[PDB]
């Protein structure tokens, strides 16, 4: 449109409209050139390939891509607070995206004739890497300028080698748009209908749903013997009632479980051995053992045991300024997922006991522990909580069948997620980088809390006690930090 | 009815991630400072391209009910009549019924084509589905069996059968 | 309504306790209702 006229304005804010929210975030970005405009085949033995568990095969591309998949992109800490204290549920509706006010720099002067190529994959033909919880998200604090992450993908492998079924994709084989300093790029997306995320905690447990004042008309076996001696066998039956709530009949049972190892934040209590990988729960696929992380949604711990956390069973976030390798416990934030204990078994405990034999006068009744339990009819469970820092959506693997597609790191499982957005630098070459702006807009649907609860709720609140710094704000050096992981589950419901 | 799927995935469940970008999630990398007594410590590291085993994933492979592994090299096979005794079966009203073909599972690991499941094949091999489906002759995975403490070391069991869990995908059997 | 552009979260009124003999603002074992504390109206903030 013009060299000396801007192609777009800056939109950051949220509108709370009735039953809906509209979030809009605009960021400043910079895209370099990757691999000297080349594709370069990557395998593990390139870096030395220690384990077959780590053995991979794939490529790297010159293209970049945008990832807005984390909640702190679209929600300020206050917007997050308004949403979680006031609402039982939410879910996305429409998506909106703009790429504008582009600039290209020859390495440093202005190149006004250079272009930037961008395309979205709306038939989902490329490997979709947006559901892998990678770094490179639009920064939470809108004044941060960020670097576009380099795109890459993996395909089939045997060891470091490829196979006959392995694939290779050329992103140049997709028609794309070319943008100069007056051009802009935009598109609109429509989320496919998903169930509302539950931003609430049950006020009742699955086993306490009974009337405490009344007996059941059901009976249970109270006594198998009259007393101590020989040949004391008898069958007694009692009424299940208030005084014994453990034996009563129930219509629904807690959800599935896959047991985790229990680790204490008090280091002396832990065993003095390298049990971090050896004791971990894993699943093996094609001879390769992959760790189970975070796994099925289960409560982190039992009442009175908050010092413990499941080894691979929780989402762990880094604090601002934390390093990449071998950081201390204080430097990370281990999320707590106890709201779900009402319907979900404790991650570090066995699902229960089963009878392992037939009793007789010659054999005692023997039971054994259920370490893992698949879906049974009558089970009810909560999905994993979503956080300000955590993932929004994921793509459901395209397969003959799936069960409860909701992803295991939290968020909204989608067969047609938001499409990936690829970008590059159009290229012996001139050293070159481009910058510009990005604005994203999402419409959210909200489920209002209609509770008749008499006493006041638990709310998320900023502490008033004096401190050196304001939480969710910059320090003296100008660094923005998020002091804690904020889940969405505060308000309560009846089970 | 749904379209029968007639394709082989070019990607595996464990290989979904972007090989060039580090995950923003931490895992527990080390539980001891060094060798010897009183070395307990807690160290965490970013999951990344170098270690692809420990990453977090949104989806896990489908259910499995293990089969006995029989080799096309007769000498390798055990010297006993284990065709019936070593078979995976289900019991219904007092009657044992063999599991045939059974849940759709990869017939063998990649790198061994001489093995096949005892009752698990129609000898047509399913190895194309080894991407999202575990191996009929292998364990589904390992499960922690206790609480480790200063006295007791961490322990793990084997999962021979695994029922449906939320977040599983699988391929059906081929026609 | 409040339209504040404040970035960080507000202070809210919430029930602080974890485990306790009586939930606040509810009957006791004798059936006696009670209001545990006096609650003010001022939590959200404005610019002066």
């Amino acid at each position: 449109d013009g060299v000396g006229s801007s192609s777009g304005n800056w939109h950051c804010d949220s509108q709370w409209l009735g039953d809906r929210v509209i979030t809009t975030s605009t960021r400043t970005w910079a895209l370099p050139t990757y691999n000297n405009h080349l594709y370069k085949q990557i395998s593990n033995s390139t870096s030395g390939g220690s384990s077959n568990d780590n053995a991979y095969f794939g490529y790297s591309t010159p293209w970049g891509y945008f990832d807005f998949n984390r909640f702190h992109c679209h929600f300020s800490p206050r917007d997050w607070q308004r949403l979680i204290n006031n609402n039982w549920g939410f879910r996305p509706k429409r998506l909106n995206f703009k790429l504008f006010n582009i600039q290209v720099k020859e390495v440093i002067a202005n190149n006004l004739t250079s272009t930037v190529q961008v395309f979205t994959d709306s038939d989902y033909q490329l490997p979709y890497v947006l559901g892998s919880a990678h770094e490179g998200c639009l920064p939470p604090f809108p004044a941060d300028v960020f670097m576009i992450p380099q795109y890459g993908y993996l395909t089939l492998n045997d060891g470091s080698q490829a196979v006959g079924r392995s694939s290779f994709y050329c992103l140049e084989y997709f028609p794309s748009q070319m943008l100069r300093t007056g051009n802009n790029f935009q598109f609109s997306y429509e989320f496919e209908n998903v169930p509302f995320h539950s931003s609430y905690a049950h006020s009742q447990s699955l086993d306490r749903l009974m009337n405490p004042l009344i007996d059941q008309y059901l009976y249970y076996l109270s006594k198998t013997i009259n007393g101590s001696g020989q040949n004391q066998q008898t069958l007694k039956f009692s009424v299940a009632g208030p005084s014994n709530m453990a034996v009563q009949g129930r219509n629904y049972i807690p959800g599935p479980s896959y047991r985790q190892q229990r680790v204490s934040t008090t280091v002396t209590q832990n065993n003095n051995s390298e049990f971090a990988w050896p004791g971990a729960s894993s699943w093996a696929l094609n001879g390769r053992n992959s760790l189970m992380n975070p796994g099925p949604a289960m409560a982190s711990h039992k009442e009175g045991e908050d010092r413990f956390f499941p080894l691979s069973g929780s989402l762990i976030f880094g604090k601002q300024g934390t390093g990449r390798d071998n950081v201390d416990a204080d430097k990370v934030m281990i999320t707590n997922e106890e709201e779900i204990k009402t319907t979900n078994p404790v991650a570090t405990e066995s699902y229960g006991q089963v009878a392992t034999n037939h009793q007789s006068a010659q054999a005692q009744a023997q039971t054994g522990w259920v370490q893992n339990q698949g879906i049974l009819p009558g089970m009810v469970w909560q999905d994993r909580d979503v956080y300000l820092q955590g993932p929004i959506w994921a793509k459901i693997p395209h397969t003959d069948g799936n069960f409860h597609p909701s992803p295991l790191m939290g968020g909204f499982g989608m067969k047609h997620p938001p499409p990936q957005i690829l970008i590059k630098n159009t290229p012996s070459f001139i050293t070159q980088y481009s910058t510009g702006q990005v604005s994203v807009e999402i419409e959210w649907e909200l489920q209002k809390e209609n509770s008749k609860r008499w006493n006041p709720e638990i709310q998320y609140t900023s502490n008033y006690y004096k401190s050196n710094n304001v939480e969710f704000a910059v320090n003296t050096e100008g660094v923005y930090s998020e002091p804690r992981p904020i889940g969405t589950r505060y308000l309560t419901r009846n089970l | 009815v749904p379209f029968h799927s007639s394709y082989a995935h070019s990607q595996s469940l464990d290989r979904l991630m972007n090989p060039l970008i580090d995950q923003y999630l931490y895992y527990l990398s080390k539980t001891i400072n060094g060798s010897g007594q009183n070395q307990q410590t807690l160290k965490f590291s970013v999951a990344g391209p170098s270690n692809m085993a420990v990453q977090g994933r949104n989806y896990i492979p489908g259910p499995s009910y293990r089969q006995q592994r029989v080799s096309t090299t007769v000498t390798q096979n055990n010297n006993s009549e284990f065709a019936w005794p070593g078979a995976s079966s289900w019991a219904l009203n007092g009657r044992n019924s063999l599991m045939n073909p059974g849940p759709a599972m990869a017939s063998h690991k990649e790198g061994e084509d001489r093995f096949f499941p005892l009752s698990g094949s129609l000898i047509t091999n399913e190895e194309e589905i080894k991407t999202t489906n575990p191996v009929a002759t292998e364990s589904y995975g390992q499960v922690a069996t206790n609480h480790q403490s200063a006295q007791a070391q961490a322990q793990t069991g084997w999962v021979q059968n695994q029922g449906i869990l939320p977040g599983m995908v699988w391929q059906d059997r081929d026609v | 309504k409040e339209n504040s552009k404040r970035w960080n979260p507000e202070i809210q009124y919430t029930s602080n306790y974890y485990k306790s003999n009586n939930v606040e603002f509810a009957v006791n074992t004798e059936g006696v209702y009670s209001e545990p504390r006096p609650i003010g109206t001022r939590y959200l903030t404005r610019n002066l």
Partner: antibody
């Protein structure tokens, strides 16, 4: 300010029971871990017990464990240290200390760091 | 159980001149050590936390250093207010442990 009033006082006969109270004021009671530190006559000061802000984690010293019990009442912002089956060496002046580290319920972390604000203390003779 | 041993048991020194006290822990506890002082008849007061960080009210003449096993509490510009029994504490793991103490 921040103010810690502990009075369990007492002179008891060995094997007897005593309950220390510490009335805390001026800070968010739930978000800080409260601990008891003990100092015998003419000796060094010895840590006894601590309790999480949410009271989900109570830590006892090795000599103390199984006898003393720490708890907190959220209605009166008071931390209790009931001790039973007391012994001669329990004679000392007990302190009530607030922790430096502020915590919340949404992260699993150790609840003890350093004792920021102490208290004048009471005497337990036995 | 982790043991903190504070090397000078008692000490006396001239005012204004540097004094240094150290304690050696039984294991690598990283930066978890803390420092306190107790005057006769008065409750203890926190000086240093997380090995070197000083408390808001503590004078800048106090400082601390070390990691792993070894930790030192250095006092430059000793003063008459500064004469008291001093302690080092581990914050690393429970049960928590105080040093033997140093009367200065």
């Amino acid at each position: 300010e921040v103010q810690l009033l502990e009075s369990g006082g007492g002179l008891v006969h060995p094997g007897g029971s005593l309950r220390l109270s510490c009335a805390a004021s001026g800070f968010p009671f739930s978000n800080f871990a409260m601990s008891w530190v003990r100092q015998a006559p003419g000796k060094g000061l010895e840590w006894v017990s601590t309790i999480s802000g949410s009271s989900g984690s109570t830590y006892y010293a090795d000599s103390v464990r199984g006898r003393f019990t720490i708890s907190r009442d959220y209605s009166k912002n008071t931390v209790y240290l009931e001790m039973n089956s007391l012994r001669a060496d329990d004679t000392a002046i007990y302190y009530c200390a607030k922790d430096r580290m502020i915590t919340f319920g949404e992260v699993i972390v150790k609840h003890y760091d350093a004792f920021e604000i102490w208290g004048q203390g009471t005497r337990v003779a036995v | 159980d982790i043991q903190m041993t504070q090397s000078p048991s008692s000490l006396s020194a001239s005012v204004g001149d540097r004094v240094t006290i150290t304690c050696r822990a039984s294991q690598t506890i990283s930066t978890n050590v803390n420092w306190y002082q107790q005057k006769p008849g008065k409750a203890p007061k926190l000086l240093i936390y997380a090995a070197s960080s000083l408390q808001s009210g503590v004078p800048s003449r106090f400082s601390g250093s070390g990691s792993g096993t070894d930790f030192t509490l250095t006092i430059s510009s000793l003063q008459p207010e500064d004469f008291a029994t001093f302690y080092c504490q581990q914050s690393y793991s429970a049960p928590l442990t105080f040093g033997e103490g140093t009367k200065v």
